[PDB]
């Protein structure tokens, strides 16, 4: 679920403010996501978007009709280390893994302030 992805970005990145840092960043961090992504971080978001599309295409997810941000899963954190619980069934695991992958990706990519809050209509 989105609140869990938020939890994961705090887990992977200590004092982060996830919605204030990553939403409406570049061309892909946020909703929508169109164009050429503007940096590694943006590419994290674009990969995340492709992951959720693949979720919706996944046979294991056939009974999720809403979008994967509404699918709760099981996860834990340990010293900045995110854990997708083995207890997860197929769809929950896959969506858990999308969020984890993007959580780590955010932590390793450089944050470019100047890419925050672009004019997507012009540049994406």
Ligand X SMILES: CCCCCCCCCCCCCCCCCCOC[C@@H](O)COP(=O)(O)OCC[N+](C)(C)C
- Sole residue written with tokens 């570049």: 26
Active site residue 99: yes
> Would you call 40 helix, strand, or coil by DSSP?
helix
- Is position 33 annotated in a ligand binding site? no
- Interface residue with ligand X, options 15, 20, 31, 113 (CB under 6 A): 31
Positive or negative, the CA dihedral 75, 101, 120, 56 is negative
Nearest distance in Å: CB 93, Na ion = 18
- Binds 1: which of ligand X, Ca ion, Na ion, none (CB < 5-8 Å by kind): Na ion
Closest CA to 18 of 31, 4, 28: 4
Q: How many CB atoms lie within 10 A of CB 37?
A: 21
The number of helices, as runs of H, and strands, as runs of E, in the chain is 5, 2
For residue 29, the 8-state DSSP code is B
- Is position 32 annotated in a ligand binding site? yes
- Binds 117: which of Na ion, a copy of itself, ligand X, none (CB < 5-8 Å by kind): a copy of itself
- Binds 28: which of Ca ion, Na ion, ligand X, none (CB < 5-8 Å by kind): Ca ion
Task: Check residue 22 for interaction with ligand X (CB under 6 A).
Answer: yes
Active site members: 48, 99
Which residues in this chain contact ligand X in the complex, by CB under 6 A? 2, 5-6, 9, 18-19, 22-23, 31-32, 69
């Amino acid at each position: 679920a989105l609140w869990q992805f938020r939890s994961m970005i705090k887990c992977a990145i200590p004092g982060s403010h996830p919605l204030m840092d990553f939403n409406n960043y570049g061309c892909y961090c946020g909703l929508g996501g169109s164009g050429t992504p503007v940096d590694e971080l943006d590419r994290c978001c674009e990969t995340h978007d492709n992951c959720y599309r693949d979720a919706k295409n996944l046979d294991s997810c056939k009974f999720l009709v809403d979008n994967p941000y509404t699918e709760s899963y099981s996860y834990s954190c340990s010293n900045t280390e995110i854990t997708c619980n083995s207890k997860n069934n197929a769809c929950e695991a896959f969506i858990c893994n999308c969020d984890r992958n993007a959580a780590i990706c955010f932590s390793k990519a450089p944050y470019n302030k100047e890419h925050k809050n672009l004019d997507t209509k012009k540049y994406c």
